[PDB]
Amino acid sequence: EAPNQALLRILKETEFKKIKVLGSGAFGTVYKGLWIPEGEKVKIPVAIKESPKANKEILDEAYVMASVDNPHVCRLLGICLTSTVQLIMQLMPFGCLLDYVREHKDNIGSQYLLNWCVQIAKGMNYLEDRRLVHRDLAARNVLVKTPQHVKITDFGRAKLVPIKWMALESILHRIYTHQSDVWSYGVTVWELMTFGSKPYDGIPASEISSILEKGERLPQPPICTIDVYMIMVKCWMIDADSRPKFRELIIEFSKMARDPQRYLVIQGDERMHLPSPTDSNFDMDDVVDADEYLI
Numbered sequence: 001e002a003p004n005q006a007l008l009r010i011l012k013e014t015e016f017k018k019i020k021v022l023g024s025g026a027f028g029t030v031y032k033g034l035w036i037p038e039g040e041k042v043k044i045p046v047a048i049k050e051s052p053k054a055n056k057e058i059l060d061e062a063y064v065m066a067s068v069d070n071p072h073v074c075r076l077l078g079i080c081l082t083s084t085v086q087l088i089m090q091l092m093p094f095g096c097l098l099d100y101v102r103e104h105k106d107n108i109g110s111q112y113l114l115n116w117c118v119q120i121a122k123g124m125n126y127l128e129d130r131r132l133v134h135r136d137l138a139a140r141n142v143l144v145k146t147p148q149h150v151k152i153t154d155f156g157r158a159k160l161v162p163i164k165w166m167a168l169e170s171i172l173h174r175i176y177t178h179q180s181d182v183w184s185y186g187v188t189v190w191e192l193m194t195f196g197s198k199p200y201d202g203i204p205a206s207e208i209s210s211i212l213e214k215g216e217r218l219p220q221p222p223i224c225t226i227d228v229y230m231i232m233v234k235c236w237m238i239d240a241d242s243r244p245k246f247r248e249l250i251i252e253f254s255k256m257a258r259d260p261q262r263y264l265v266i267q268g269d270e271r272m273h274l275p276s277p278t279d280s281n282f283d284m285d286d287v288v289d290a291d292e293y294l295i
């Protein structure tokens with residue numbers, strides 16, 4: 001296909017300062033930091049992600065992340081070439097959407113939930129245009145820049161095992177398509193609508209494939225109207241080509257986001273509010289968010 005003319009930016013270790021540790025998982029460590037390029041008078045808040053095999057895996061992710069550019073996808077700002085290479089990306093100050101829905105349940109209204117669905121579908125449809133199959137879309141892999149702006153991340157599995165988020169063809173035949181990402185999208189929506197419930201909780205992964213073959217699906221979340229659950233059910237159909245396209249998901253959730261109380265029934269949804277760029281939210285003097293630092 002077309003040549004990938006994306007720029008791989010190499011950043012000097014001296015150009016950024018690590019503030020604290022955000023977390024540690026089954027990969028390494030995520031740090032919070034500040035990238036202060038050369039003599040540019042800017043401070044960009046960043047996240048820093050840190051044997052030969054380990055470096056191959058991380059450089060494969062750098063490649064995918066450097067090749068995307070969308071408001072609803074996390075892009076690579078650059079890499080740092082230390083003993084083990086570090087991925088430098090935009091700091092998403094509110095962490096992952098999964099923990100966010102769990103921690104802020106009492107202030108999350110229908111407007112926020114339906115807008116997140118549109119934004120996730122937008123990022124996903126962009127990955128589809130760029131011919132990338134995510135293979136790991138889940139609420140844990142959606143980051144929160146602000147409560148009103150979310151982005152898809154974790155390109156470690158992205159191609160040109162999370163059993164409970166996979167399409168039955170993926171579990172059984174290792175078949176991955178944009179239509180199998182649509183299944184993962186349905187599960188992600190379910191995670192949001194339940195305010196972060198674990199899908200098929202208590203059920204071991206070995207039984208999932210068989211549960212799906214019989215025709216069992218995730219239950220209707222209490223806040224979901226038949227209109228919203230119908231969309232989730234459509235994402236979990238056996239015939240992959242029967243599932244909605246992401247471009248249809250943008251349309252469907254957009255219509256709903258225009259009249260959110262008609263599609264999600266939440267007690268107190270209206271008098272609920274989350275941090276906006278009015279006070280608190282944000283030396284703070286020369287800090288510029290990566291979305292405004294264009295080069």
Ligand SMILES: Cc1cc(Nc2cc(NC(=O)c3c(Cl)cccc3Cl)ccn2)nc(N[C@@H](C)CO)n1
Pocket residue numbers: 022023024027029030047049089090091092093094095096140141142143153154
């Ligand atoms: C308050 C806060 C902010 C933030 N921001 C952040 C996190 C990123 N995390 C990841 O990119 C990440 C994900 Cl979402 C999955 C697997 C590995 C990584 Cl490094 C990237 C950018 N900003 N992350 C966290 N906790 C991380 C451990 C979750 O990953 N907490």
